Design a protein around this ligand. Structure first.
Ligand SMILES: [Cl-]
Length: 513
RNA sequence: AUAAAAUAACAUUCUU
């Protein structure tokens, strides 16, 4: 009566408690959620041998791991800035733990150790899709058909699992035979049709631009949807915005969110807006149309959403902007002022707004726009991060009207802000900004001379490297930014024979490293 | 827990 009784009881407690947390709108409950998942994954390997491990209990774990991926992504965007790739971060490790946990469960399902239901199969395949493992989703789904336990095999063939698979099948095969078969059956059917089957078929017809069949199915999904499970209406509505090549239909659904015309609640997912903006730019080359959609999105967001969302939006907008004004810094500068005035009228300016603008403005290769952005940080009273000081240093590599004194000054300001904001060491992004302001600029000038037919930037670069080497996050960064950097920028090989001498005369002033 | 179990923005600075 107790093969693994107590471990089954504590499994149901932490899984249900963590699922209730991740579905209801640091803190102790936050720590409870992540510890419950590690505990649940700990008990899983023990309960994997038990026959009393219901396909329900395993589906609840897969759903929990899926909500963990959703929470880990939400924590990344809520941060004041993205963590450096070369440093330890909760987002990186927790994502790998979740992914590996889901990879172990999938293999156990394919082996036959553990059963699963269609509700768990959907969360397992949706998780791998969110992890950019689309090809693996098809292989697990097709391998599920050849399984001993028909119960698990029948689960992967349920309509809600097929609904998730329809968009992947049309992307891989371009086949509309089975989708057109289902459309003729679903439209006339008087029986229950799962909403995920509606949603997957709508997305296929949106990509195939059979909008009348997509809109007809969307109407049936609309009249049948339940308030408790209205999320299917969100996915499809957003799919009309970011996946429809018909920009008139995509904008009609976009204004339906702006004007709050839908009976169901719906977020203006910035990934959907970014795809919509890119489709307008690629199809029409009309910046005014892009600018009009971006204005409505900024007004819709305001101060309601996290700063990382507006950072993603402005990244898409300013990338399009400086592609349009790549050869016109005169009209572009006046346009930026209009953009700055509008953005100020909506909310207080965040740092990523000017960070993105300054980064993409490097193709103008003018110092005035660098000094303009730098003064606007203080003029608009922007809460500063180390991102701006990194970009301000990197910006010097795109102009000639600069000196080694300013390069060192903007490096010192970075190191001061690193220590002021409690940074441990010097990250890769800090040295890359210094590398782009010296080595890359020098290499570009030499390539111009060969193609055509404050004295030295590289000397200051190698001098700062040696002076600040003890403050590095790892001494392997010395090889990365000298010998390894010379592999892509060969002009550095001419300076590295004397790096052993390493005469230095910089001016560090550290505090609270 | 039972035609059910929905929805989750992958941001600016980072070739090694
Ligand atoms: Cl910071």
């Amino acid at each position: 009566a107790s093969p693994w009784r107590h471990e089954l009881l504590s499994f149901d407690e932490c899984v249900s408690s963590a699922l209730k947390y991740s579905t209801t709108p640091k803190n102790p409950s936050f720590a409870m959620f992540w510890d419950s998942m590690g505990r649940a994954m700990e008990l899983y390997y023990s309960l994997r041998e038990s026959p009393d491990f219901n396909a329900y209990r395993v589906s609840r774990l897969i759903h929990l791991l899926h909500n963990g991926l959703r929470s880990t992504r939400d924590q990344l965007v809520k941060l004041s800035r993205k963590p450096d790739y070369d440093s330890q971060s909760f987002h990186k490790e927790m994502m790998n733990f979740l992914c590996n946990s889901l990879k172990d469960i999938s293999d156990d399902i394919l082996i036959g150790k553990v059963s699963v239901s269609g509700y768990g199969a959907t969360h397992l395949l949706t998780s791998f899709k969110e992890l950019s493992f689309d090809d693996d989703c098809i292989r697990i789904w097709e391998a599920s058909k050849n399984l001993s336990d028909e119960t698990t095999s029948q689960a992967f063939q349920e309509p809600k699992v097929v609904g998730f698979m329809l968009p992947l099948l049309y992307a891989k095969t371009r086949s509309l035979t089975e989708p057109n078969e289902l459309y003729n059956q679903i439209i006339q059917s008087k029986e229950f049709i799962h909403p995920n089957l509606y949603s997957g078929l709508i997305k296929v017809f949106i990509k195939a631009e059979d909008y009348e069949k997509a809109l007809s199915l969307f109407g049936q999904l609309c009249e049948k949807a339940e308030v408790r499970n209205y999320g299917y209406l969100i996915e499809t509505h957003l799919s009309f915005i970011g996946d429809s090549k018909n920009l008139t239909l995509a904008e009609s659904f976009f204004d339906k969110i702006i004007n709050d015309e839908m009976p169901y609640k719906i977020i203006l997912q910035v990934s959907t807006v970014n795809s919509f903006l890119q489709n307008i730019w690629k199809a029409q080359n009309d910046f005014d149309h892009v600018y009009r959609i971006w204005e409505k999105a900024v007004k819709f967001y305001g101060n309601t959403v996290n700063p990382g969302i507006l950072s993603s939006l402005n990244n898409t907008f300013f990338t399009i902007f400086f592609e349009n004004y790549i050869n016109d810094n005169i009209n572009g500068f006046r346009k930026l002022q209009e953009i700055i005035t509008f953005y100020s009228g909506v909310k207080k300016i965040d740092e990523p707004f000017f960070n993105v603008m300054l980064t993409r403005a490097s193709i103008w290769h003018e110092r005035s726009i660098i000094d303009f952005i730098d003064k606007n940080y203080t003029l608009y009273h922007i809460p500063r991060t180390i991102i701006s000081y990194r970009i301000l240093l990197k910006s010097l590599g795109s102009i000639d009207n600069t000196n080694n004194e300013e390069i060192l000054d903007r490096w010192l300001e970075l190191v001061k802000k690193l220590n002021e904001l409690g940074q441990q060491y010097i990250a890769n992004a800090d040295l890359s900004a210094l590398r782009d302001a010296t080595v890359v600029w020098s290499q570009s000038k030499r390539d111009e001379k060969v193609f055509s037919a404050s004295e030295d930037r590289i000397e200051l670069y190698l001098k700062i490297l040696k002076r600040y080497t003890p403050y590095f996050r790892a001494t392997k960064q010395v090889y990365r930014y000298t010998t390894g950097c010379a592999e892509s920028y060969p002009i550095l090989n001419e300076y590295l024979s004397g790096y052993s001498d390493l005469s230095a005369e910089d001016i560090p002033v550290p505090q609270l490293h």
